[PDB]
């Protein structure tokens, strides 16, 4: 549906076509992250460090537990009904997240039946027997540091030094914690917070968390970096200072009839100036409909664009029309920077601004000349099996498109200035001339 | 002043109303961060690691000390005078920050009278007696690591291993340092740099810094995450390699007659398409004047929006007029993504795009039908005490607004495309049609 020939003529060189994947079908695993280390092996000279740490951690965790209890006290089985009056104000995502929190409350209670065992956990990773057939895992923050650094050195340093080191470790853990579990966490109910953010409760070590829970190795890293492996805090304990996090392990599902077309931006020549067209570099085509996509929220991979949700966004009529051939409607922007892509390789074919980049033919030793009325030059086997563009030498292939590509002129779009302040000034000028008319 | 009924009819569901808080009245505390550890307990085989570290740290700190001395040498008391000619070029914020730096120079000199005691600080946190009634605290970077890891293991590993570990620790500290105290820090005079950034001089452990200085626990976390607890480097020592930072502990003041109204965005139907209105999700109303707010710079809390400054920004006439009822002036954007909020809960009342989300009435077992001429459906007690929207079951309340809400049609705004490239293309098209006219 995209007129790739005309797009390449205005510098939109056809890039890698990627399939569109969105997280689906989350496998739910509940893990315990005990935010307080077990200092029983060094309690002899702990001092008041643990009490102050408990006070600070309770102050941090109390808003989270209150926001959770907002939904835990207004949700009950019918079939799961939610007290909208008691909730009062909520978004759809937050309401479904409250439903998910309620469904996780059964396993949360089963885990909380092991509160004493969670407290006695003296290793950074411990498996606890929930009901002799289900097991829960406790991730104790800083327990590794305690057991590996402080306990082995009780008598090597004075116990006051051990106390100070413990206080410093706890405060560093809190400092790393506060960006995630602090006042920024105003909606702990939502199960959209990534497991990487959740792992700050374990010191940012989400690798240990995920390998301990277990996962499908298929697309695991892709699900991680697409922010698809999310965690939801299910239970907050203000006495044992641990959280229960339900970690959502989704799979990747290919969106039907959806591919994301990357366009490689290449500067071109018009008049005697260098231009790059202002066209999205990632085009989502779904069910033969062209739309934008907020691909910054997604993980771009060599074969697929992997998102945690549908990030399709609408496309204006002019951009859809010019991506389909009406290139006079694709906007272009002046190139005043020396670092702009002068060429790109597409299907073994070079599309180059040979006016701005030195195009030389490595086989016949001749210079590939671009006239002033040409935007790009398509360089392929028919003209130059091997081409030198600057200092890089590229052996080319056959252009599957038109054979009169370099002789067929294209209609050029209108110049634009995509700077924010330039956008405001252009709005000013348009409003002024509109009022004049 | 906001027409919440009409706004909800075009998907702007009334969210949580928040009070507007801005930092004020900073309590100033001066702390010493010794950016070099005391290796006297392990100096036997330290090698040239500390000399190289001193060279690198001096290179890092010299621009900061020079930038400070630009004001310290051009600021005099009569009442505090600055030589504007000697300063030459400065912003208002930087000038007031230079005033703050000058007022902190007295305590800076009082602390620097303890230069020898600062150099002998062999613990990560040490309290020093300034004048037998004032105390200053020294935060020695990596001293905790030295005392906890390297000193206890002098003979366990070869001292060359201790030297290499010390060098690695110092280099890791410098690597974390350079993002904050490096060339990015071109305005150390400004007291707008957060204490979290300042704490990189202590390894990012601002929890230890703030607990050591002491603070009002009221709104402390909210002041941290709003970037209100800022630090100003007051003194840089290039011989003992320590900085004096004045930490500003402000309080929170509620802005008069100011509330920030959150609007929950919900897709609606017009014609046979989904639409979401392009209206700010956070409306600042102050003294009965409607304006935008750059709330990304603020910390949104369940009850208040907490900022380090007034982030109110002007609102265009059309947005103000349509937020007050003229919904034909609120722009809308086509919804092409499958992940859009189809409904929201406001005051126990559901506002749902029942055409796009399946609305079923849990009490009477009937389907809540939305006609094609209806944008949303207000679902409340009068029609459905309990409603099922998809799979989530919500018990509702009474809509305090109109009783003919679902029968009163609204005037619809113009479609837009808020993509940056779409914005540029729309500017192109408007300019073209304007020139044609």
């Amino acid at each position, epitope marked *: 549906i995209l007129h790739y020939e005309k797009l390449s003529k205005i510098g939109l060189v056809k890039g890698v076509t990627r399939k569109y994947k969105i997280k689906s079908n989350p496998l739910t695993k509940d893990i315990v992250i005990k935010m307080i280390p077990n200092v029983s092996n060094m309690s002899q000279c702990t001092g008041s460090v643990m009490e102050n740490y408990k006070t600070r951690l309770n102050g941090i965790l109390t808003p989270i537990k209150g926001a959770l209890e907002i939904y835990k006290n207004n949700t009950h089985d019918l079939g799961v009904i939610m007290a909208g009056v008691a909730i009062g104000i909520a978004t759809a995502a937050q309401i479904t997240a409250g439903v998910a929190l309620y469904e996780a409350m059964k396993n949360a209670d089963n885990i909380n039946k092991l509160k004493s065992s969670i407290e006695s956990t003296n290793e950074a990773v411990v498996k606890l027997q929930e009901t002799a057939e289900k097991t829960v895992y406790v991730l104790t923050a800083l327990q590794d540091y305690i057991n590996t650094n402080l306990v082995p050195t009780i008598d090597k340093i004075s116990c006051k030094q051990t106390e100070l080191s413990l206080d410093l470790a706890l405060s560093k853990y809190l400092s790393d914690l506060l960006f995630v579990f602090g006042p920024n966490l105003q909606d702990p109910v939502s199960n959209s917070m990534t497991i990487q953010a959740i792992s700050q409760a374990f010191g940012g070590n989400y690798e240990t968390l995920l390998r301990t829970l277990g996962y499908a190795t298929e697309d695991f890293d892709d699900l991680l970096e697409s922010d698809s492996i999310t965690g939801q805090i299910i239970y907050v304990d203000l006495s044992s200072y641990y959280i229960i996090v339900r970690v959502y392990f*989704p799979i990747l599902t290919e969106i039907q009839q*959806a591919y994301i077309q990357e366009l490689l931006p290449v500067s071109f020549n018009n008049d005697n100036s260098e231009w790059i067209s202002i066209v999205p570099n990632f085009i989502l085509v779904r069910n033969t409909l062209i739309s934008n996509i907020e691909i910054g929220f997604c993980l771009i991979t060599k074969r697929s664009v992997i998102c945690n*949700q549908d990030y399709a966004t609408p496309m204006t009529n002019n951009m859809r029309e010019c991506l389909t051939g009406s290139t006079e409607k694709c906007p272009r922007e002046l190139v005043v920077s020396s670092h702009v892509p002068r060429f790109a390789l597409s299907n073994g074919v070079l599309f180059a601004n040979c006016i701005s980049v030195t195009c030389q033919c490595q086989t016949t030793g001749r210079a590939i000349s671009q006239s002033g009325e040409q935007t790009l030059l398509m360089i392929d086997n028919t003209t130059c099996p091997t081409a030198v563009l600057g200092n890089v030498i590229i052996s080319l292939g056959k252009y599957l498109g038109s054979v009169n590509y370099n002789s067929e002129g294209i209609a050029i779009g209108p110049p634009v200035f995509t700077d924010k302040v330039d956008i405001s000034s252009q709005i000013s000028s348009m409003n002024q001339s509109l009022q004049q008319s | 002043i906001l027409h919440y009924e009409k706004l909800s009819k075009i998907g702007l569901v009334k969210g949580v109303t928040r009070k507007y808080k801005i930092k004020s009245n900073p309590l100033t505390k001066d702390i010493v961060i010794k950016m070099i550890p005391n290796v006297s307990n392990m100096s036997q085989c330290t090698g040239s690691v500390m000399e190289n570290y001193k060279t690198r740290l001096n290179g890092i700190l010299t621009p900061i000390k020079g930038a400070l001395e630009i004001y310290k040498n051009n600021t005099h008391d009569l009442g505090v005078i600055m030589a504007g000619v000697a300063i030459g070029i400065a912003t208002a914020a930087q000038i007031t920050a230079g005033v703050a730096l000058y007022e902190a120079m007295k305590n800076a000199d009082n602390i620097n009278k303890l230069k020898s005691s600062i150099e002998s600080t062999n613990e990560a946190v040490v309290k020093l007696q300034e004048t037998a009634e004032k105390t200053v605290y020294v935060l020695t970077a990596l001293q905790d690591y030295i005392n906890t890891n390297l000193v206890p293991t002098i003979d366990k590993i070869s001292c060359k291993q201790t030297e290499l570990s010390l060098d690695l620790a110092l280099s890791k500290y410098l690597s974390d340092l350079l993002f904050v105290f490096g060339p990015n820090l071109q305005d150390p005079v400004s007291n707008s740099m957060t204490i979290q950034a300042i704490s990189q001089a202590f390894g990012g452990n601002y929890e230890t810094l703030l607990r050591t200085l002491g603070y009002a626990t009221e709104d402390f976390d909210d002041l941290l995450e709003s970037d209100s607890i800022t630090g100003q480097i007051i003194y840089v020592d290039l011989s003992s390699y320590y900085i004096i930072v004045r930490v500003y502990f402000p309080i929170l003041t509620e802005i008069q007659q100011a509330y920030i109204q959150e609007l929950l965005p919900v897709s609606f139907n017009n014609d046979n398409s989904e639409w979401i209105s392009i209206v700010p999700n956070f409306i600042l109303v102050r003294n009965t004047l409607i304006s935008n707010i750059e709330i990304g710079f603020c910390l949104i809390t369940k009850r208040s929006v907490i900022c380090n400054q007034d982030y109110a920004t002007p609102m265009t006439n059309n947005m103000r007029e349509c937020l007050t009822g003229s919904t034909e002036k609120c722009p809308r954007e086509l919804v092409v993504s499958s992940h859009v909020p189809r409904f929201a809960l406001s005051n126990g009342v559901l506002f749902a795009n029942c055409i796009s989300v*399946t609305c079923q009435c849990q009490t009477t077992g009937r389907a809540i039908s939305q006609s094609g001429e209806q944008t949303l459906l207000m679902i409340d007690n009068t029609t459905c005490p309990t409603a099922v929207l998809g799979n989530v079951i919500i018990s509702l309340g009474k809509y305090l607004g109109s009783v003919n809400y679902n029968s009163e049609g609204i005037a619809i705004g113009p479609p837009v495309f808020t993509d940056k490239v779409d914005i540029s293309s729309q500017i192109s098209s408007m300019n073209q049609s304007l020139q044609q006219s």
Partner: antibody, heavy 116, light 105 residues
Framework: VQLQQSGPELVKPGASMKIACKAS????????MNWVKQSHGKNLEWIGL????????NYNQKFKGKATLTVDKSSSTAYMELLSLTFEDSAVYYC??????????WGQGTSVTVSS | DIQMTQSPASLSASVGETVTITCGAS??????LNWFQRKQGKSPQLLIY???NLADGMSSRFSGSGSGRQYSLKIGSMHPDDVATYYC?????????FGGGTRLE
């Protein structure tokens, strides 16, 4: 909560046929439907799932190309178009509702036979 | 694919005595194992999901356990009704495979 299959069909080899799976009693869009192939009355094997909410599909490698899953959100119906039918494609085909990972509600199944 | 194996392919025991239906997995599936009951001529019914959780509407005598790659479905006291075929389904990795099947008579 019901899943209505299209019904047993007699289809010629090399042809293409479509299983209909009407849904009722629940939110069709908010549940994923899986498809499984019951061959020889004993062996079960998962064909693929379709997420009607997002339009996404996840196929078994064995069934890529042979089976394509579509949905009809207007009719709350999910389809399984079977391509290039052979004798091995003669089996019992189920549509199973899936919240995320547990096929709790199944269609009655379509015993599809491939012959002339 | 994860090969999902059931040891007692065909088992017949007296009514009212404990029955353990063991299932195995080629790879560790971390409790992402579903159990399905397929009576003769009828669609498989979700029996136990998550390798421990009893599915709603199912009898309390189904007490399936297990962790890692080796699992087990327990019947306890039989009844003539649960004479069916039991399938343990892999759920961890995307090609959600099934076990061979246990026909209990």
């Amino acid at each position: 909560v019901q899943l209505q299959q299209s019904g047993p069909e007699l289809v010629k080899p090399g042809a293409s046929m479509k299983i209909a799976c009407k849904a009722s009693g629940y939110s069709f869009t908010d549940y994923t439907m899986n498809w499984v192939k019951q061959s020889h009355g004993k062996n079960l094997e998962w064909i693929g799932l379709i997420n009607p909410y997002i339009g996404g599909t996840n196929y078994n490698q064995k069934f890529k190309g042979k089976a394509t899953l579509t949905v009809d959100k207007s009719s709350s119906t999910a389809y399984m178009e079977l391509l290039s039918l052979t004798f091995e494609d003669s089996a019992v085909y189920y549509c199973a509702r899936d919240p995320s990972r547990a096929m709790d509600y199944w269609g009655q199944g379509t015993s599809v036979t491939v012959s002339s | 694919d994860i090969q999902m194996t059931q040891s007692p392919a065909s088992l017949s025991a007296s009514v009212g005595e404990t029955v353990t239906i063991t299932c195995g997995a080629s790879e560790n599936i971390y409790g992402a194992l579903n159990w399905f009951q397929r009576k003769q001529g009828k669609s498989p019914q979700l029996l136990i999901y998550g390798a421990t959780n009893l599915a709603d509407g199912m009898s309390s005598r189904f007490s399936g356990s297990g962790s890692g790659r080796q699992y087990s479905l327990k019947i306890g006291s039989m009844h003539p009704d649960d004479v069916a075929t039991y399938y343990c389904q892999n759920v961890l990795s995307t090609p959600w495979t099934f076990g061979g099947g246990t026909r209990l008579e």
